[PDB]
């Protein structure tokens, strides 16, 4: 617990602040990366479910992937209010450790083929908790920095939490296939290639990780003492997770033959780098300028992607996966850009309007870190919208399309709306 935090006296900073902040940064991402790992597990799990006992409709499966964001976006609200009640140390542990329960429970469900969908829904929701682990970690790493590095720092906390989805999607398809846990009696299905798929392994390698990090949060982590702008973030980040979630599912329903999980990780891994340097690009080379050029690419790829499917064009996958990388890159920058915009928009407002109308560089740095609540809570509604779109289309129709089209009109409408405030 800290008492005398003066981030802003260059000396306090140079000879101290820039040692503790840089430490607490390095723990916050851990407790985040991992949290995103957990949040988006029904990415790869939902795919491989049926290659075991399970036979869930491909509408149920999308839903599974789509369900975390429901509990996640609701929770993203209260989670802002948490650090300020319990602080950076204490909270970052609870909200991290609380995460083992669904993880363990899912390795368990998945090991039991006669286990009904309802249970997965409970689990899916319990995974959405890990999604709210960003309203906090965002509104916490702020008070560790000047307003000078409040930008860069929020960005490195930002774009490495989202590195988490990608890091699991590369890892968790792979550990299914090594008997890491069978010393616990974890069961598996012997595969065609003649190697056991043990799917609990995608849900259990997180456990120890989680624990180590929630123990690191228990050490080196310490404490301290216009609803439209959100609609854009939704557009530019809901696409990141929305496509992170209900994508690999989608590359199954379109190219059932490709071994997707071997390649789906790259999408977010692209889009995570893309969220990041997409604030520095936004500063030292534009800002509002970007978001449009950007949106008018999403729009592009959004439309384009109609071409790469089994029927319309030749069913080309190495086209489908080409384009989705576009869709990540883009959906990536903007989330970092319409986040940074939102931030100084909000810095200005409450620095200016509140202190020039009427300590404002106090009721604003600690207020920006708040208004990040509503924005990201809303901004996570995309990855419910998305996979659930896809699922539903494929249900009542038989294809994407009626999903791909609402997304298309989305970008357009957006590419359009930003012009009106240009």
Short mmCIF file of C-alpha atoms in Angstrom, two decimals:
data_model
loop_
_atom_site.label_atom_id
_atom_site.label_comp_id
_atom_site.label_asym_id
_atom_site.label_seq_id
_atom_site.Cartn_x
_atom_site.Cartn_y
_atom_site.Cartn_z
CA UNK A 1 0.00 0.00 0.00
CA UNK A 2 1.35 3.42 -1.05
CA UNK A 3 0.71 6.72 0.75
CA UNK A 4 2.94 9.38 -0.92
CA UNK A 5 2.44 8.88 -4.68
CA UNK A 6 3.77 11.89 -6.62
CA UNK A 7 4.07 10.52 -10.19
CA UNK A 8 4.62 13.98 -11.56
CA UNK A 9 7.60 15.52 -9.81
CA UNK A 10 10.15 14.55 -12.52
CA UNK A 11 12.50 13.51 -9.72
CA UNK A 12 9.90 11.55 -7.77
CA UNK A 13 9.31 9.96 -11.14
CA UNK A 14 12.86 9.55 -12.37
CA UNK A 15 14.20 8.33 -9.07
CA UNK A 16 11.11 6.28 -8.09
CA UNK A 17 7.68 6.54 -9.85
CA UNK A 18 9.22 5.19 -13.02
CA UNK A 19 10.22 2.10 -11.05
CA UNK A 20 7.02 1.20 -9.40
CA UNK A 21 4.73 2.05 -12.30
CA UNK A 22 6.97 0.00 -14.63
CA UNK A 23 6.75 -2.86 -12.15
CA UNK A 24 2.98 -2.64 -11.68
CA UNK A 25 2.66 -2.44 -15.44
CA UNK A 26 4.52 -5.73 -15.85
CA UNK A 27 2.12 -7.46 -13.42
CA UNK A 28 -1.09 -5.83 -14.70
CA UNK A 29 -0.57 -7.29 -18.20
CA UNK A 30 0.09 -10.73 -16.83
CA UNK A 31 -3.07 -10.57 -14.82
CA UNK A 32 -4.62 -9.37 -18.05
CA UNK A 33 -3.11 -11.39 -20.88
CA UNK A 34 -4.19 -14.39 -18.83
CA UNK A 35 -7.63 -12.88 -18.18
CA UNK A 36 -8.14 -12.53 -21.98
CA UNK A 37 -6.83 -16.07 -22.35
CA UNK A 38 -9.68 -17.21 -20.10
CA UNK A 39 -12.28 -14.94 -21.58
CA UNK A 40 -12.05 -16.27 -25.14
CA UNK A 41 -11.73 -19.93 -24.54
CA UNK A 42 -14.97 -20.93 -26.24
CA UNK A 43 -13.10 -19.89 -29.38
CA UNK A 44 -11.18 -23.09 -29.79
CA UNK A 45 -13.15 -25.21 -27.41
CA UNK A 46 -16.43 -24.62 -29.23
CA UNK A 47 -14.81 -25.94 -32.42
CA UNK A 48 -13.46 -29.25 -30.99
CA UNK A 49 -16.45 -30.05 -28.81
CA UNK A 50 -18.06 -32.44 -31.23
CA UNK A 51 -14.86 -34.37 -31.95
CA UNK A 52 -15.67 -35.71 -28.54
CA UNK A 53 -18.96 -36.99 -27.13
CA UNK A 54 -20.75 -33.70 -27.67
CA UNK A 55 -23.13 -33.12 -30.53
CA UNK A 56 -24.33 -29.51 -30.22
CA UNK A 57 -25.91 -27.72 -33.15
CA UNK A 58 -23.70 -25.19 -34.87
CA UNK A 59 -26.13 -22.61 -33.63
CA UNK A 60 -25.46 -23.65 -30.04
CA UNK A 61 -21.71 -23.52 -30.73
CA UNK A 62 -21.60 -19.99 -31.95
CA UNK A 63 -23.75 -19.07 -28.95
CA UNK A 64 -21.16 -20.70 -26.66
CA UNK A 65 -18.44 -18.55 -28.21
CA UNK A 66 -20.74 -15.47 -28.02
CA UNK A 67 -21.84 -15.80 -24.44
CA UNK A 68 -18.94 -14.48 -22.41
CA UNK A 69 -19.45 -10.96 -23.79
CA UNK A 70 -22.96 -10.84 -22.35
CA UNK A 71 -21.76 -11.30 -18.77
CA UNK A 72 -18.55 -9.46 -19.72
CA UNK A 73 -20.20 -6.25 -20.86
CA UNK A 74 -22.57 -6.12 -17.95
CA UNK A 75 -19.73 -6.66 -15.55
CA UNK A 76 -17.39 -4.17 -17.26
CA UNK A 77 -19.54 -1.58 -15.49
CA UNK A 78 -19.20 -2.47 -11.78
CA UNK A 79 -15.56 -3.33 -12.45
CA UNK A 80 -14.59 0.32 -12.92
CA UNK A 81 -15.93 1.01 -9.43
CA UNK A 82 -13.80 -1.72 -7.95
CA UNK A 83 -10.21 -0.58 -7.89
CA UNK A 84 -11.39 2.67 -6.19
CA UNK A 85 -13.09 0.56 -3.56
CA UNK A 86 -10.34 -2.07 -3.09
CA UNK A 87 -7.30 -0.80 -4.97
CA UNK A 88 -4.72 -2.18 -7.39
CA UNK A 89 -3.16 -4.84 -5.23
CA UNK A 90 -6.24 -6.35 -3.54
CA UNK A 91 -8.60 -6.21 -6.55
CA UNK A 92 -6.26 -7.42 -9.26
CA UNK A 93 -5.83 -10.53 -7.14
CA UNK A 94 -9.53 -11.27 -6.45
CA UNK A 95 -10.59 -10.60 -10.02
CA UNK A 96 -7.76 -12.76 -11.24
CA UNK A 97 -8.08 -15.66 -8.81
CA UNK A 98 -11.89 -15.68 -9.16
CA UNK A 99 -11.05 -16.87 -12.67
CA UNK A 100 -9.84 -20.35 -11.81
CA UNK A 101 -13.33 -21.54 -11.02
CA UNK A 102 -14.70 -21.49 -14.60
CA UNK A 103 -11.41 -22.76 -16.06
CA UNK A 104 -11.37 -25.78 -13.74
CA UNK A 105 -15.06 -26.34 -14.20
CA UNK A 106 -14.71 -26.34 -17.97
CA UNK A 107 -11.80 -28.82 -18.06
CA UNK A 108 -14.28 -30.86 -16.04
CA UNK A 109 -17.42 -30.39 -18.20
CA UNK A 110 -15.38 -31.11 -21.31
CA UNK A 111 -14.17 -34.39 -19.82
CA UNK A 112 -17.78 -35.58 -19.45
CA UNK A 113 -19.53 -36.20 -22.80
CA UNK A 114 -22.93 -36.71 -21.23
CA UNK A 115 -23.03 -33.15 -19.90
CA UNK A 116 -25.84 -30.89 -21.09
CA UNK A 117 -25.58 -27.55 -22.95
CA UNK A 118 -27.01 -25.64 -19.98
CA UNK A 119 -23.84 -26.28 -18.04
CA UNK A 120 -21.76 -24.82 -20.85
CA UNK A 121 -23.91 -21.70 -20.70
CA UNK A 122 -23.21 -21.33 -17.01
CA UNK A 123 -19.49 -21.83 -17.81
CA UNK A 124 -19.51 -19.48 -20.81
CA UNK A 125 -20.95 -16.80 -18.50
CA UNK A 126 -18.41 -17.54 -15.84
CA UNK A 127 -15.86 -16.89 -18.53
CA UNK A 128 -17.28 -13.52 -19.37
CA UNK A 129 -16.25 -12.40 -15.86
CA UNK A 130 -12.61 -12.41 -17.09
CA UNK A 131 -13.76 -9.87 -19.65
CA UNK A 132 -14.52 -7.23 -17.03
CA UNK A 133 -10.90 -7.66 -15.97
CA UNK A 134 -10.15 -4.70 -18.23
CA UNK A 135 -12.38 -1.91 -16.84
CA UNK A 136 -10.23 -2.40 -13.77
CA UNK A 137 -6.80 -2.97 -15.22
CA UNK A 138 -7.38 0.05 -17.46
CA UNK A 139 -8.69 2.31 -14.77
CA UNK A 140 -5.80 1.33 -12.56
CA UNK A 141 -2.62 1.54 -14.55
CA UNK A 142 -3.57 5.19 -15.13
CA UNK A 143 -2.76 6.41 -11.64
CA UNK A 144 0.72 5.12 -12.05
CA UNK A 145 1.73 7.52 -14.67
CA UNK A 146 2.05 11.17 -15.53
CA UNK A 147 -0.62 12.29 -17.96
CA UNK A 148 2.47 12.30 -20.20
CA UNK A 149 2.86 8.53 -20.18
CA UNK A 150 -0.80 7.93 -19.30
CA UNK A 151 -1.15 7.57 -23.05
CA UNK A 152 1.69 5.15 -23.76
CA UNK A 153 1.03 3.18 -20.62
CA UNK A 154 -2.70 2.70 -21.09
CA UNK A 155 -1.65 1.52 -24.57
CA UNK A 156 0.80 -1.15 -23.36
CA UNK A 157 -1.76 -2.39 -20.82
CA UNK A 158 -4.38 -2.17 -23.63
CA UNK A 159 -2.67 -4.08 -26.45
CA UNK A 160 -1.13 -6.88 -24.43
CA UNK A 161 -4.34 -7.86 -22.67
CA UNK A 162 -5.62 -8.38 -26.20
CA UNK A 163 -2.46 -10.27 -26.99
CA UNK A 164 -4.02 -12.81 -24.58
CA UNK A 165 -6.70 -14.04 -26.91
CA UNK A 166 -4.12 -14.71 -29.58
CA UNK A 167 -1.62 -16.26 -27.18
CA UNK A 168 -4.21 -18.91 -26.09
CA UNK A 169 -5.44 -19.58 -29.61
CA UNK A 170 -1.92 -20.57 -30.58
CA UNK A 171 -1.20 -22.50 -27.37
CA UNK A 172 -4.48 -24.20 -26.47
CA UNK A 173 -5.01 -26.03 -29.75
CA UNK A 174 -1.56 -27.50 -29.14
CA UNK A 175 -1.77 -28.67 -25.53
CA UNK A 176 -4.90 -30.67 -26.23
CA UNK A 177 -2.49 -33.12 -27.81
CA UNK A 178 0.06 -33.64 -25.04
CA UNK A 179 -0.89 -35.73 -21.96
CA UNK A 180 0.22 -32.94 -19.63
CA UNK A 181 -2.49 -33.65 -17.08
CA UNK A 182 -3.25 -37.29 -17.51
CA UNK A 183 -1.22 -37.84 -14.39
CA UNK A 184 -4.51 -36.51 -12.90
CA UNK A 185 -6.57 -38.99 -14.87
CA UNK A 186 -7.62 -36.44 -17.42
CA UNK A 187 -9.20 -38.48 -20.20
CA UNK A 188 -9.03 -38.15 -23.98
CA UNK A 189 -10.15 -39.33 -27.39
CA UNK A 190 -7.44 -41.08 -29.41
CA UNK A 191 -7.31 -39.30 -32.79
CA UNK A 192 -7.10 -40.43 -36.41
CA UNK A 193 -3.37 -39.41 -36.72
CA UNK A 194 -3.08 -41.58 -33.64
CA UNK A 195 -2.61 -38.94 -30.97
CA UNK A 196 -4.91 -38.31 -28.08
CA UNK A 197 -6.93 -35.19 -28.03
CA UNK A 198 -7.39 -34.32 -24.39
CA UNK A 199 -9.44 -31.17 -24.40
CA UNK A 200 -9.38 -30.34 -20.66
CA UNK A 201 -5.82 -29.38 -21.36
CA UNK A 202 -7.01 -26.18 -22.99
CA UNK A 203 -8.83 -25.26 -19.76
CA UNK A 204 -6.19 -26.45 -17.27
CA UNK A 205 -2.90 -25.03 -18.38
CA UNK A 206 -4.45 -21.74 -17.38
CA UNK A 207 -4.94 -22.71 -13.82
CA UNK A 208 -1.28 -22.74 -12.74
CA UNK A 209 -0.54 -19.70 -14.85
CA UNK A 210 -3.46 -17.85 -13.27
CA UNK A 211 -2.31 -18.83 -9.78
CA UNK A 212 1.30 -17.66 -10.37
CA UNK A 213 0.06 -14.32 -11.67
CA UNK A 214 -2.50 -13.89 -8.90
CA UNK A 215 0.45 -14.55 -6.53
CA UNK A 216 2.46 -11.87 -8.38
CA UNK A 217 -0.50 -9.49 -8.01
CA UNK A 218 -0.34 -10.36 -4.30
CA UNK A 219 3.30 -9.25 -4.21
CA UNK A 220 4.74 -6.46 -6.45
CA UNK A 221 1.32 -4.85 -7.07
CA UNK A 222 0.54 -1.84 -4.86
CA UNK A 223 -2.09 0.92 -4.43
CA UNK A 224 -2.68 4.72 -4.41
CA UNK A 225 -5.19 7.35 -3.10
CA UNK A 226 -21.68 12.10 -25.56
CA UNK A 227 -22.72 8.42 -25.26
CA UNK A 228 -22.10 8.48 -29.01
CA UNK A 229 -18.26 8.32 -28.79
CA UNK A 230 -18.76 4.81 -27.36
CA UNK A 231 -20.73 3.72 -30.46
CA UNK A 232 -17.56 4.12 -32.47
CA UNK A 233 -15.38 1.99 -30.17
CA UNK A 234 -17.99 -0.77 -30.35
CA UNK A 235 -17.44 -0.56 -34.15
CA UNK A 236 -13.70 -0.74 -33.89
CA UNK A 237 -13.19 -3.24 -31.12
CA UNK A 238 -16.37 -5.34 -31.00
CA UNK A 239 -14.97 -6.34 -34.35
CA UNK A 240 -11.70 -7.40 -32.74
CA UNK A 241 -13.26 -9.74 -30.22
CA UNK A 242 -16.42 -10.50 -32.22
CA UNK A 243 -14.16 -11.88 -34.93
CA UNK A 244 -11.83 -13.34 -32.33
CA UNK A 245 -14.69 -15.41 -30.94
CA UNK A 246 -16.97 -16.50 -33.74
CA UNK A 247 -14.33 -16.83 -36.38
CA UNK A 248 -12.72 -20.18 -36.04
CA UNK A 249 -16.31 -21.39 -35.79
CA UNK A 250 -16.93 -19.64 -39.07
CA UNK A 251 -13.89 -21.10 -40.81
CA UNK A 252 -15.33 -24.48 -39.80
CA UNK A 253 -18.71 -23.93 -41.38
CA UNK A 254 -17.16 -22.64 -44.61
CA UNK A 255 -14.04 -24.76 -44.97
CA UNK A 256 -14.87 -27.77 -42.76
CA UNK A 257 -11.74 -29.39 -44.13
CA UNK A 258 -9.08 -26.93 -42.93
CA UNK A 259 -7.30 -27.37 -39.61
CA UNK A 260 -8.27 -23.91 -38.46
CA UNK A 261 -6.95 -23.58 -34.84
CA UNK A 262 -3.51 -24.10 -36.35
CA UNK A 263 -3.98 -20.67 -37.93
CA UNK A 264 -6.80 -18.69 -36.21
CA UNK A 265 -4.42 -17.30 -33.57
CA UNK A 266 -2.67 -15.13 -36.09
CA UNK A 267 -5.80 -13.02 -36.53
CA UNK A 268 -5.88 -11.61 -33.02
CA UNK A 269 -2.04 -11.66 -32.97
CA UNK A 270 -2.16 -9.38 -35.87
CA UNK A 271 -5.00 -7.33 -34.38
CA UNK A 272 -3.21 -6.97 -31.02
CA UNK A 273 -0.10 -5.41 -32.49
CA UNK A 274 -2.63 -3.42 -34.56
CA UNK A 275 -4.45 -2.02 -31.49
CA UNK A 276 -1.19 -0.82 -30.07
CA UNK A 277 1.00 1.23 -32.44
CA UNK A 278 -2.49 2.42 -33.56
CA UNK A 279 -2.42 5.21 -30.99
CA UNK A 280 1.09 6.45 -31.72
CA UNK A 281 0.24 6.40 -35.42
CA UNK A 282 -2.92 8.31 -34.37
CA UNK A 283 -0.90 10.93 -32.51
CA UNK A 284 2.26 11.69 -34.48
CA UNK A 285 0.33 11.27 -37.81
CA UNK A 286 -3.39 12.20 -37.53
CA UNK A 287 -6.14 10.92 -35.20
CA UNK A 288 -9.69 11.38 -36.48
CA UNK A 289 -8.05 11.19 -39.89
CA UNK A 290 -7.23 7.51 -39.25
CA UNK A 291 -10.55 6.25 -37.88
CA UNK A 292 -12.19 7.04 -41.27
CA UNK A 293 -9.52 5.73 -43.62
CA UNK A 294 -9.68 2.78 -41.24
CA UNK A 295 -13.50 2.41 -41.23
CA UNK A 296 -13.30 2.76 -45.00
CA UNK A 297 -11.34 -0.48 -45.13
CA UNK A 298 -13.46 -2.44 -42.68
CA UNK A 299 -16.28 -1.39 -44.99
CA UNK A 300 -14.03 -2.58 -47.85
CA UNK A 301 -13.02 -5.97 -46.42
CA UNK A 302 -16.58 -6.25 -45.08
CA UNK A 303 -17.93 -6.12 -48.61
CA UNK A 304 -15.01 -7.84 -50.33
CA UNK A 305 -15.21 -10.96 -48.03
CA UNK A 306 -18.46 -11.83 -49.81
CA UNK A 307 -16.23 -13.06 -52.70
CA UNK A 308 -14.40 -15.80 -50.79
CA UNK A 309 -17.00 -18.48 -50.06
CA UNK A 310 -18.19 -21.94 -51.30
CA UNK A 311 -20.42 -20.89 -54.23
CA UNK A 312 -20.15 -17.14 -55.00
CA UNK A 313 -16.45 -17.13 -55.78
CA UNK A 314 -14.56 -20.37 -55.94
CA UNK A 315 -14.59 -21.56 -52.33
CA UNK A 316 -11.14 -20.19 -51.64
CA UNK A 317 -10.02 -20.44 -48.02
CA UNK A 318 -6.57 -18.93 -48.56
CA UNK A 319 -8.70 -16.00 -49.65
CA UNK A 320 -11.09 -16.17 -46.66
CA UNK A 321 -8.14 -16.18 -44.26
CA UNK A 322 -6.39 -13.50 -46.30
CA UNK A 323 -9.35 -11.15 -45.81
CA UNK A 324 -10.00 -11.91 -42.18
CA UNK A 325 -6.45 -10.76 -41.44
CA UNK A 326 -7.48 -7.50 -43.02
CA UNK A 327 -10.54 -7.42 -40.79
CA UNK A 328 -8.32 -7.90 -37.74
CA UNK A 329 -5.63 -5.41 -38.63
CA UNK A 330 -8.34 -2.77 -39.08
CA UNK A 331 -10.66 -3.76 -36.27
CA UNK A 332 -7.39 -3.47 -34.35
CA UNK A 333 -6.03 0.02 -34.99
CA UNK A 334 -9.35 1.75 -34.41
CA UNK A 335 -9.97 0.24 -30.99
CA UNK A 336 -6.59 1.68 -30.00
CA UNK A 337 -7.38 4.89 -31.91
CA UNK A 338 -11.02 5.46 -30.88
CA UNK A 339 -9.73 4.64 -27.39
CA UNK A 340 -6.98 7.26 -27.45
CA UNK A 341 -9.35 9.78 -29.09
CA UNK A 342 -11.96 9.16 -26.39
CA UNK A 343 -9.23 9.64 -23.78
CA UNK A 344 -7.98 13.11 -24.66
CA UNK A 345 -11.49 14.06 -25.77
CA UNK A 346 -12.31 13.26 -22.19
CA UNK A 347 -9.11 14.81 -20.79
CA UNK A 348 -9.88 18.08 -22.61
CA UNK A 349 -13.60 18.16 -21.68
CA UNK A 350 -12.98 17.82 -17.95
CA UNK A 351 -9.68 19.76 -17.86
CA UNK A 352 -11.14 22.59 -19.93
CA UNK A 353 -14.93 22.80 -19.61
CA UNK A 354 -14.91 21.91 -15.90
CA UNK A 355 -11.97 24.14 -14.79
CA UNK A 356 -12.52 26.96 -17.31
CA UNK A 357 -16.21 26.95 -16.44
CA UNK A 358 -15.19 26.71 -12.79
CA UNK A 359 -8.03 20.02 -9.32
CA UNK A 360 -9.46 19.53 -12.83
CA UNK A 361 -6.20 17.72 -13.67
CA UNK A 362 -7.36 15.57 -10.73
CA UNK A 363 -11.13 15.21 -11.24
CA UNK A 364 -10.26 14.25 -14.88
CA UNK A 365 -7.30 11.85 -14.84
CA UNK A 366 -9.29 9.93 -12.22
CA UNK A 367 -12.41 10.73 -14.27
CA UNK A 368 -11.04 9.63 -17.67
CA UNK A 369 -10.09 6.32 -15.98
CA UNK A 370 -13.78 6.17 -15.14
CA UNK A 371 -15.48 7.18 -18.40
CA UNK A 372 -13.45 4.29 -19.83
CA UNK A 373 -16.04 2.19 -18.05
CA UNK A 374 -19.11 3.01 -20.08
CA UNK A 375 -17.09 3.03 -23.33
CA UNK A 376 -15.53 -0.42 -22.97
CA UNK A 377 -18.62 -1.96 -21.40
CA UNK A 378 -20.49 -0.94 -24.54
CA UNK A 379 -17.38 -1.80 -26.67
CA UNK A 380 -17.52 -5.41 -25.55
CA UNK A 381 -21.10 -5.78 -26.79
CA UNK A 382 -19.70 -6.50 -30.30
CA UNK A 383 -18.42 -10.01 -29.51
CA UNK A 384 -21.91 -10.99 -28.47
CA UNK A 385 -23.54 -9.36 -31.50
CA UNK A 386 -21.01 -10.98 -33.84
CA UNK A 387 -20.79 -14.67 -33.16
CA UNK A 388 -24.49 -14.62 -32.36
CA UNK A 389 -25.20 -12.98 -35.66
CA UNK A 390 -23.28 -15.72 -37.56
CA UNK A 391 -24.85 -18.49 -35.51
CA UNK A 392 -28.35 -17.17 -36.15
CA UNK A 393 -27.85 -16.60 -39.82
CA UNK A 394 -26.59 -20.14 -40.27
CA UNK A 395 -29.62 -21.20 -38.29
CA UNK A 396 -32.66 -19.59 -39.89
CA UNK A 397 -30.93 -19.47 -43.25
CA UNK A 398 -28.03 -21.80 -44.03
CA UNK A 399 -25.16 -19.40 -44.60
CA UNK A 400 -23.36 -16.29 -43.18
CA UNK A 401 -24.47 -13.39 -45.44
CA UNK A 402 -27.42 -12.01 -43.42
CA UNK A 403 -24.79 -11.55 -40.79
CA UNK A 404 -22.03 -10.43 -43.19
CA UNK A 405 -24.46 -7.85 -44.52
CA UNK A 406 -25.47 -6.26 -41.19
CA UNK A 407 -21.75 -5.96 -40.49
CA UNK A 408 -21.25 -4.47 -43.96
CA UNK A 409 -23.97 -1.85 -43.48
CA UNK A 410 -22.42 -1.23 -40.06
CA UNK A 411 -19.06 -0.07 -41.38
CA UNK A 412 -20.63 1.92 -44.18
CA UNK A 413 -23.01 3.63 -41.68
CA UNK A 414 -19.97 4.25 -39.51
CA UNK A 415 -17.74 5.37 -42.36
CA UNK A 416 -20.64 7.68 -43.05
CA UNK A 417 -21.23 8.95 -39.46
CA UNK A 418 -17.63 10.03 -38.92
CA UNK A 419 -17.84 12.21 -42.08
CA UNK A 420 -20.72 14.17 -40.48
CA UNK A 421 -18.40 15.19 -37.63
CA UNK A 422 -15.67 15.96 -40.20
#
